Design a protein around this ligand. Structure first.
Ligand SMILES: *[C@@H]1O[C@H](CO)[C@@H](O[C@@H]2O[C@H](CO)[C@@H](O)[C@H](O)[C@H]2NC(C)=O)[C@H](O)[C@H]1NC(C)=O
Ligand SMILES: *[C@@H]1O[C@H](CO)[C@@H](O[C@@H]2O[C@H](CO)[C@@H](O)[C@H](O)[C@H]2NC(C)=O)[C@H](O)[C@H]1NC(C)=O
Ligand SMILES: CCCCC[C@@H](/C=C/[C@@H]1[C@@H](C/C=C\CCCC(=O)O)[C@@H]2C[C@H]1OO2)OO
Ligand SMILES: CCCCC[C@@H](/C=C/[C@@H]1[C@@H](C/C=C\CCCC(=O)O)[C@@H]2C[C@H]1OO2)OO
Ligand SMILES: CCCCCCCCO[C@@H]1O[C@H](CO)[C@@H](O)[C@H](O)[C@H]1O
Ligand SMILES: CCCCCCCCO[C@@H]1O[C@H](CO)[C@@H](O)[C@H](O)[C@H]1O
Ligand SMILES: *[C@@H]1O[C@H](CO)[C@@H](O)[C@H](O)[C@H]1NC(C)=O
Ligand SMILES: *[C@@H]1O[C@H](CO)[C@@H](O)[C@H](O)[C@H]1NC(C)=O
Ligand SMILES: *[C@@H]1O[C@H](CO)[C@@H](O)[C@H](O)[C@H]1NC(C)=O
Ligand SMILES: *[C@@H]1O[C@H](CO)[C@@H](O)[C@H](O)[C@H]1NC(C)=O
Lengths: 552, 552
């Protein structure tokens, strides 16, 4: 019965029920008047008649390599750009946070509760007629279908971008701090109240945990040496909470910031690395400050590491993920005169877009061997067996599956991807065209447009009928990739903002934090400013096995 | 042994232990180089040689009344000013938050833990030699002395500013949401994680509580009618948690957002008002949206009310408290192009400066009667007896005690004010000259300067010896008032920033919030934009008894 059901209000306008069967649009600071926030104002026009399509830009970003090389070696220029990129996004996210699962209108309970996941777009009134408000049928295509009909991988599709296993597990490992949905509660609730890059996966969310993972000496994290190698410590020695299957031997039950991380030798590997990184830093500090305390070292480290991370992600991970020729730079000093809200709340959407299963290979080739999901899972014995070094090298090449192309979802991952759809539905997610419009994206006029190819498209049009009624998550994996890219435009234009927020919006990136002091001074500062997934592995891993998020 | 103990680094510089008996200053974005962040840069100079003393300004603010009347009527002008005032402060606070009780260096644990109270200035290394770092003796003057020697009120001193009881109880009541120190934990910890104006005192901090205080109908708060009047409801009917003394009869045990508020008929009175305000709003909304739900009304109300509050404080309370001739305006639209961090963490300092006991009268004259603390305390029977209307009128006149003059602390309040000193000491608070310097205030060179008068001064100099070693809290109450003002410069220049933060930095003051929609549209929006302690009482209280925070 909700007169807003139809998502009438345009351009970030706000719909309000001005009576049982009537509504109203809050076209405030939107740039458009009219009952629907459509009629634009002048500057609006000129603003749009100077707004280049993302594809256009993306293009320019990935071409003229020669020129990009020029700028890539001209500090002010580079920054001037990187900044532009920074700022280009910025004005997109709703910070401070607004809606969430249960709240379609701004509410204190909303803005306050931290267990919720904020929503870039409001849900749909449970009173609304159709799942997408009004357009569509009493229901949505069964997921199993869609799942199969266009998602599940038939022939493994490699990511044209060269995304190796390293990248995959990173992204996997990394994103696992922010995204941490508490299911006991629901799909919409997170358990990572840190709502951002806080390496809680390395040090636990609660202090209690953190302390058990702490050695309380030189601010180092409790560790353990197996076969002359540094590894996370046992659950039987730290009593830390770790999610493991009955058979696992105590000598194998690893304890780390994240309780789930034991079920994936891929994850565990990274852990071990970072863990090693931390303590590595501790030593460097204890060198600088022979007069510091355990609790100070431990805390300075965590600050420096968080820095590195934010760096290695933006400058490596994200860099590669974009395939731009411009070298992405991480320097907060760029927002020091930019109206930027150094804060962040994690959105449901951003979580879903994450469901990057396609990356997942069909087997896991470590050195000679090749493993199956059925094999890999919870078999850290694997990790122990081959060693970090090999793992690195190995994973540094085993290309990962493309993700936007279509039907490239491992069958083992079956269950998951389905949920990914089922969920968004429960959370009354909005139409993909809505989320498209939201981020100022022209909506897809035909399934064929969304895919390019006519196969799936037609196959989908069968299922959804109205392009509008197309679900986001799905549309994302099926989306029509960019020229050899791994993602479509949609997935990029959504995570780009969402990301550079929690990335930049992190405390340490704020003025009264960005300084040597904050990190034990210059030395420990440099560390962050000179951090690459490369060195991260170089230092922490034996023999400095070369690596990249790119398979050569 | 801490080489930083001596607070060497100047101008917000950061000190770091560069070895056992050596340190270093992080003069970053400070404006000064030199080992101590002293040598200034050019623009710095020109910036200072254009920086008018607060006293100067304060003066200009409280004079030329004729001119102020001119501007007070030319919108752009007024705003242009108010804004200036807004922005003048801003660049002072450390948002996002930095140090706290246990942390003198920036730390995650710090920035993360919300039970802590942030600290505008770092504590002092427990390893430091003297309580104020180095200057001073192995200890500090016994508090009992100071307490008596210069704090306790002998002859009641009225605030020259006319601060009636209304103001007092408001300030009291209002500030009681942010400040809510959890003693079970310690002096440094707050229980109001809301860390700001969130009217948790009206709706409780936890949802559980809130729901019990909710009637779940038209989004109204559960209430009760006694003798034809609207009053908060009983603990025996809501099971809400309320702090009460054994004798109190259930029929008197009031349940309200704040558990402590029952022990002060002054507080309770305000509650009842606000409570009445809320439900009042609910009706106005239910009029606008006959199609809204209990939980939406309830939430919109709380949003509108929070607005009112932020208004009534800034525009009334704060206005009066300043005695400026310029009419202070509350309009977030002023920061919509200002690098302002719409967020807030409550500082310990700000909490202490609050300890405004001097305001407290010696008796409480309600109509004919006159009461004693021993009387008033936990005697809401009083409130019930006379009625809200009288209470208003009465309190609207009973002048409150000045606070900066000196020795004006009620003896009943004895215990408290002492604590106020004892505490800051535990929390290793810094020197008053430090906190002075901090907010770019020339430090007091002599106790006589801090007081003007020679009596107390001399009396103190006996106790502290070095002006520097003068404690803040004390120095505040004894401080030398402004020409007929109720506060000295120190207290003003500290709470000014601290305040306009949590005041402005509140969500609802942010761009994606400041709009009719957010509040059920224009109608419910206007409400906030047209709110005065006056109307607040006018609407909620019978007969619209005139009021002001000024006793005529
Ligand atoms: C605002 O948007 C609504 C739709 O969200 C428009 O209303 C529809 O207009 C068509 C064409 O006249 C009618 O056939 C429909 O019955 C209307 N309602 C709906 C729910 O579709 C409306 O015309 C728009 N107004 C403006 C000024 O843009
Ligand atoms: C920086 O500040 C320190 C004090 O915080 C200064 O050091 C003192 O200087 C005096 C005068 O030479 C000596 O008598 C003291 O022994 C020094 N130490 C202390 C703890 O007082 C120092 O001179 C300042 N340096 C600069 C460049 O400003
Ligand atoms: C606060 C932490 C932010 C981390 C951001 C990180 C990206 C993570 C991935 C996201 C995809 C978004 C953007 C990548 C493409 C780069 C670009 O748009 O140009 C979601 C979550 C995860 O998978 O899917 O980079
Ligand atoms: C987020 C909530 C902000 C509330 C602000 C409120 C003031 C509270 C008092 C403060 C004094 C500061 C300024 C008052 C003088 C007005 C002015 O400077 O012109 C501190 C805390 C308390 O006592 O001492 O007003
Ligand atoms: C001076 C440099 C001018 C660069 C103009 C670039 C215009 C790019 O144009 C883009 O090309 C894409 C193909 O890759 C299409 O998919 C997009 O729809 C189209 O807008
Ligand atoms: C064009 C307007 C010029 C105004 C000049 C104002 C100078 C105020 O000067 C101030 O006066 C106070 C007395 O009230 C003193 O206590 C302060 O120390 C003094 O700086
Ligand atoms: C957040 O909301 C959920 C459901 O509304 C509730 O169960 C939970 O206790 C809330 N969290 C907090 C911290 O209030
Ligand atoms: C686990 O790994 C070890 C060593 O690689 C191997 O011997 C064992 O068969 C594996 N078990 C499973 C269930 O994968
Ligand atoms: C905050 O810190 C105190 C002491 O460091 C600790 O007891 C408390 O549990 C912490 N709060 C949280 C939420 O971790
Ligand atoms: C409480 O108030 C009632 C009514 O004003 C009065 O009769 C009674 O004496 C008071 N008791 C105390 C302890 O103040």
């Amino acid at each position: 019965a909700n007169p807003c059901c139809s998502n009438p209000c345009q351009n970030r306008g706000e719909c309000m029920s001005t009576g049982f069967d009537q509504y109203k649009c809050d076209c405030t600071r939107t740039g458009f008047y009219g009952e629907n926030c459509t009629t634009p104002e002048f500057l609006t026009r000129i603003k749009l008649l100077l707004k280049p399509t993302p594809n256009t830009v993306h293009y320019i970003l990935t071409h003229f390599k020669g020129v990009w090389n020029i700028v890539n070696n001209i500090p002010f220029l580079r920054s001037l750009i990187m900044k532009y990129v920074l700022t280009s996004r910025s004005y997109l996210i709703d910070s401070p946070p607004t809606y969430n699962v249960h709240y379609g209108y701004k509410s204190w309970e909303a803005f306050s509760n931290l267990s919720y996941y904020t929503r870039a777009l409001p849900p749909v009134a449970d009173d609304c007629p159709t799942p997408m408000g009004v357009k569509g049928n009493k229901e949505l295509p069964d997921s199993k279908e869609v799942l199969e009909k266009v998602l599940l991988r038939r022939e493994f599709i490699p990511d044209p971008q060269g995304s190796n296993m390293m990248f995959a597990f990173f992204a996997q490992h990394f994103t696992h701090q922010f995204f941490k949905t508490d299911h006991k509660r629901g799909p919409g609730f997170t358990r990572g109240l840190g709502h951002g890059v806080d390496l809680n996966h390395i040090y636990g969310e609660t202090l209690d945990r953190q302390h058990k993972l702490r050695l309380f000496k030189d601010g180092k994290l409790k560790y353990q040496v197996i076969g002359g190698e540094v590894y996370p410590p046992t659950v039987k020695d730290t009593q830390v909470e770790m999610i493991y299957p009955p058979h696992i031997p105590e000598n194998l039950q690893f304890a780390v910031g994240q309780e789930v991380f034991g079920l994936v030798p891929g994850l565990m590997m990274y852990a071990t690395i970072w863990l090693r990184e931390h303590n590595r830093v501790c030593d460097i500090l204890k060198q600088e400050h022979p007069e510091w305390g355990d609790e100070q070292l431990f805390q300075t480290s965590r600050l420096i590491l968080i820095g590195e991370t934010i760096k290695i992600v933006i400058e490596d991970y994200v860099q590669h993920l974009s395939g731009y020729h411009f070298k992405l730079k991480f320097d907060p000093e760029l927002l020091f005169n930019q109206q930027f809200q150094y804060q962040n709340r994690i959105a449901s959407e951003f979580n879903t877009l994450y469901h990057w299963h396609p990356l997942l290979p069909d087997t896991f080739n470590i050195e000679d061997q090749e493993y199956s999901f059925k094999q890999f899972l919870y078999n850290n014995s694997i990790l122990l067996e081959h060693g970090l070094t090999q793992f690195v090298e190995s994973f540094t090449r085993q290309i990962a599956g493309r993700v936007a192309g279509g039907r490239n979802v491992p069958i083992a991952v079956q269950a998951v991807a389905k949920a990914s759809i089922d969920q968004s539905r429960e959370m009354k997610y909005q139409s993909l065209n809505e989320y498209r419009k939201r981020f100022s994206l022209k909506p897809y006029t035909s399934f064929e447009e969304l895919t390019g190819e006519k196969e799936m498209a037609a196959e989908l049009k069968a299922l959804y009928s109205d392009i509008d009624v197309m679900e986001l998550y799905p549309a994302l994996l099926v989306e029509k990739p960019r020229p050899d890219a791994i993602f479509g435009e949609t997935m990029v234009e959504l995570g780009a903002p969402f990301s550079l927020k929690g990335l930049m919006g992190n405390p340490i990136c704020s003025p009264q934090y960005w300084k040597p002091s904050t990190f034990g001074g210059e030395v420990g500062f440099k560390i962050i400013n000179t951090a690459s997934i490369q060195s991260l592995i170089c230092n922490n891993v034996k023999g400095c096995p070369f690596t990249s998020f790119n398979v050569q």
